[PDB]
Symmetry: C3
């Protein structure tokens, strides 16, 4: 007749890591790392992204004739740009402050293209010959569609003076440019006037552009260049243009109607007619996990990114330090299904495994609260944001990279170290709960049984099946059976 104290065992092969031991097989564990993605671009909470295909942001905004698909865009959730878009600037040149514009686009969800300067507004200039073979449409020379390349009419280019007063209640993004002619003859053939300028003024802009007539290398078959500029025209302000040549004038502008969180994503994976709450450039995530290792650059409600390949929290015991688990109790009980700790009883009346629901719920509550506390502390982590730099901005670009990679390393260490330390603490917690139950039965039985040291108490007397129950309840009468044990001794 004997009562035993033991712990759960099963056939779980899930492993966890600790500071002192790797690949410790536990009865119960919880993965906290998401490692899977649907491999496709999806709508973000019902709203489709804007996929520019082979067109860049500059080709869309200025109206590269190969980008007609986006002459009018519905509202987007985010913008997808392929890494090296073919249709960028059909006519060689530049777009000033291009990275500051992209940063501004990242906080905009909808444009409305409005005509602000009709071509009828230029009665004394030519508005139909401003085309180039560098900007082909259907094999024929063309140009950007949102601006107009004005040239001379009847061998004259009168001085332009025009003002647009923004009458909408939303800000307007407006683009214009300057053409850099190739030589003094071409300068005259196009604009007649040999010494030209472009003036642009608002309440804050005070720009003067002068053509640079020089020899340059051919790009897209052209030695000329076009330098484009942009501004944000505030609701009740006006923009004033003055030019005697080389003016690429605004025709259409963009009314910024919806502002909100967005990003310009560099991805080439295809749209998949799906919805998600979390998008990465490699694919969407559907997960309640607190961590993921898919990609740093995400948008939406996402898990926290880590470079970890494994993040598994030990919730259960060591499968088959305080000296109980794998100590004087050498192995787990597979026949014990309910509860994490309990007793095995043996007498003439019967035999069976009985769980200690009191000690078990204490352990489940603590183990569960630890998992919740761990998840809660990682709500506020560093999240990378898309910042673009140009070729003479390589120091701040490198500072950016080192900062974003720095924080990511800090949080990767924080997540992996916390799991290791608390896994160790959790295993030691189960070991302590078993010994406290072994000491609960002891100091209650006393010399009514000999403690064999294997976790069992060999009763010198005999126990009813209800006798074993009373100790499991926590109340047991030592004097009632004190007499039978003395005779059994010797």
């Amino acid at each position: 007749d004997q009562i035993c104290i033991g712990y759960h065992a099963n056939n779980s092969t899930e492993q966890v890591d600790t500071i002192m031991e790797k690949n410790v097989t536990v009865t119960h564990a919880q993965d906290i790392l998401e490692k899977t993605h649907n491999g496709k671009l999806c709508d973000l909470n019902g709203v489709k992204p804007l996929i520019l295909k082979d067109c860049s942001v500059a080709g869309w905004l200025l109206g590269n004739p190969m980008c007609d698909e986006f002459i009018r865009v519905p509202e987007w959730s985010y913008i997808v740009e392929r890494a090296n878009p073919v249709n960028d600037l059909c006519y060689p040149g530049s777009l000033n402050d291009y990275e500051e514009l992209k940063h501004l686009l990242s906080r905009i969800n909808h444009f409305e293209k409005i005509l602000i300067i009709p071509k009828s507004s230029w009665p004394n200039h030519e508005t139909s010959l401003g085309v180039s073979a560098a900007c082909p449409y259907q094999g024929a020379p063309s140009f950007f569609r949102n601006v107009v390349w004005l040239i001379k009419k009847n061998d004259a280019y009168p001085t332009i003076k025009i003002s647009y007063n923004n009458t909408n209640r939303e800000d307007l993004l407006i683009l214009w440019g300057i053409h850099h002619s190739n030589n003094a003859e071409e300068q005259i053939n196009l604009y007649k006037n040999p010494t030209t300028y472009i003036s642009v003024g608002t309440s804050t802009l005070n720009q003067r552009l002068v053509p640079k007539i020089a020899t340059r290398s051919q790009v897209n078959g052209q030695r000329g260049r076009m330098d484009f500029f942009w501004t944000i025209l505030k609701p009740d302000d006006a923009i004033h243009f003055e030019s005697n040549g080389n003016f690429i004038a605004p025709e259409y502008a963009y009314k910024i109607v919806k502002k909100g969180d967005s990003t310009i994503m560099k991805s080439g994976v295809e749209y998949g007619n799906c919805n998600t709450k979390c998008q990465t450039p490699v694919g969407a995530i559907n997960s309640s996990m607190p961590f993921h290792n898919i990609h740093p650059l995400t948008i939406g409600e996402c898990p926290k990114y880590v470079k970890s390949n494994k993040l598994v929290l030990a919730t259960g015991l060591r499968n088959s330090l305080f000296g109980a688990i794998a100590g004087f109790i050498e192995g787990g009980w597979q026949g014990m299904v309910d509860g994490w700790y309990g007793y095995h009883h043996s007498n003439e009346q019967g035999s069976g495994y009985a769980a200690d629901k009191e000690s078990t719920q204490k352990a489940i509550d603590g183990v569960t609260n630890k998992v919740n506390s761990i998840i809660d502390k990682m709500n506020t982590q560093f999240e990378a944001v898309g910042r673009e730099f140009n070729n003479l901005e390589r120091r701040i670009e490198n500072l950016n990279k080192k900062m974003e990679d720095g924080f990511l390393d800090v949080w990767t260490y924080n997540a992996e170290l916390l799991v290791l330390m608390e896994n160790e603490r959790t295993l030691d917690f189960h070991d302590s709960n078993v010994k406290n139950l072994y000491d609960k039965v002891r100091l209650q039985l006393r010399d009514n049984a000999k403690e064999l040291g294997n976790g069992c108490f060999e009763f010198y007397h005999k126990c009813d099946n209800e006798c074993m129950e009373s100790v499991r309840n926590g109340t047991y009468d030592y004097p009632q059976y004190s007499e039978e044990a003395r005779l059994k001794r010797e």
Copy 2:
């Protein structure tokens, strides 16, 4: 006759937190998080801040007529600017490198304004007509006070050639500007010469400015603009000006006399006739706490800033795992008052509580060192710093924000998780102490007493007051009571 091992209990209501359990009621605790402020701006270590009221830094340095109170400014400890000061550049335009200038002022505590170019130096130019209705003073057109808007005199504007040599040993801040006229007629009416320039040279400066005569929107009633510039003139260098018009000459310049720690605080909170060692834009801090959650931007000897709402360290024990505290000892004793651990005796002469000074003093040292160690580990933390950016520096501004918020989240997690883990260890430390003291007494008594299971030992022999003390003294003589206890065992 018995002796019991037990621990402290009081009417404390303080709650601390651990990884497994929230809201644990302990007997003693140490809050480390200051959460209150006086809601006012104050002097810093006896030095008043420079409150610019509604004047910008630009308005003070150039000398907006609305800023005349700041003509002579005493030494300051920090500068207070409203978020949108209304007295800023009364004549529209810009101040070049204004954020870089604000950055220099953050390391400056006092200027000495000096007259470097008197109006008598302009005998062939008009010095009393450079006024505008955009810069009103007392119901008449006026102008910035520290610069001079020079005009043609007798319908002439002879070329200016002037040098100022810094003969002071202090660095000199000098400001000048250019006026952009509105059309060719106004250019003649103001400065007879139609084609003008400003040249400015030092040992490192080589600047040429040319007015931009174009049409702009009216701001503060003016379609003109004034662009201002600045430089620091080293102690033996000279600045050389040449101009045939549109020149806004210096008159007064600022000698940097005191360099040190200061900040451009942004706040509209009022001055409260107070002194502090620690100042935030929402209020001043008077605390010895190691942490605060008032505001990231502080100046002076301040606590470390965290986003936490609660940061309370456990120092005492759980109020009313090794298995003693709330284990076989069901609860603490209110009647034990001079220590955390001790004994309760009961004999024929009476009863009473006694604290074990040895074990309580060891636990006090360990708990105090843990508190001190945690404060010391938090000595070096991220300190947010005011850095300013303009409308086309939003990428770097966004970089700055994410870095300062990212370090804040890292150190907030560190503070909170360390308090959680160390609070758990502290409670288990108290529980272990009590078990080791229980075993210490169990070691002396052996079979001369009985282990009840609740922390008490029922003596088999008679133990008077001197014998009770010997068990507390650690000098219990077992052989002196051997036979009586053996007789009582029957």
Copy 3:
């Protein structure tokens, strides 16, 4: 007859620190902090650094005559520049985008200088008179060696139009400049033409420079100035120059022939004819430690930098929580040399110390895995990178300093805290191992021996050497001796 449990003791004075206690003398300990350096500059894996001595990067690349030593530099590992080099721009002026050029250079291991435009390319210009006493050589006026200050010939300066196509298959760094003359007479005396320009154009570059003819302060005896500019001509692109004066033409250019890891170190420390794998501006490191506190800016396979003065890991035991070590055992054993824990026996055959191999090995494996896990987690620490900023870039310079200092503080805290926390656990780990060993012999001997409480068990029977061994072996035969012990009892 008697068997004791106890633990190792030695003559160690090594001390570790814990959260609750500092300066704990432990039996064995592992330093993880490197604190020493040879105070010299060395080759990096057999490659000698480029030591510019008193020449700046600008003086080297432009070819300041006082830098001739660096006319043909072999491949380097890192570049060493003094903090304030004396031979910088001998003719005063600037090098544009200098900090960005230094950032490109920090990723370059070898230049091959080539002659791209020889002086024969200038038949109608004077090529021997472009010298200055600001750039002495051998007591006579000279000039930068890689660039040609062209001058009028026969009182004429024909317009220069030249193109260079990069026919090499590697990137080409090209430099050029513009001379700002001092007045209209000097302009004519040097270039005949009063109104001059320089145009430069590539596939991406479209630059126009115009002399600024103004009064400036004398620097190195010159009121004039030279502004220099650079570009990277890609392997099949062309650069086009046009000018009618003030042009400082390229002569030699630098082919980028090896790209690689490198850095521009600021140091006055001497080369010492040494080799290293890890270099620091104050000295070289020869070390296998995982952490060092020498300097944040290193190059090579280096330890991770912290601000700590001490980082020592407890690997062994407290020297002479669970209540065994310095508890009921109360002291270590000097006679016990072959393990951390074990037994001292005493019988009629003699006495002697013996170690428990199993419990010692289990502790050796755990502590070794602890040390390795701590080192492994700190492999991805922040690595500071040298980044230079000019006088009007003080905001981003401060942002940079704060970021690198903030990560340094974060990772210093992580190291000190993890060493503190794991040290405390390790000492407890040993305490628990001793107790579990003590309780292993207990529960096996049972009432066949008496429990002294000082760690020893007094046998009530005769335990010969094999009986003593069976206790260490775990094969004690309880029934064989039971009657002899009950006979000795009472």
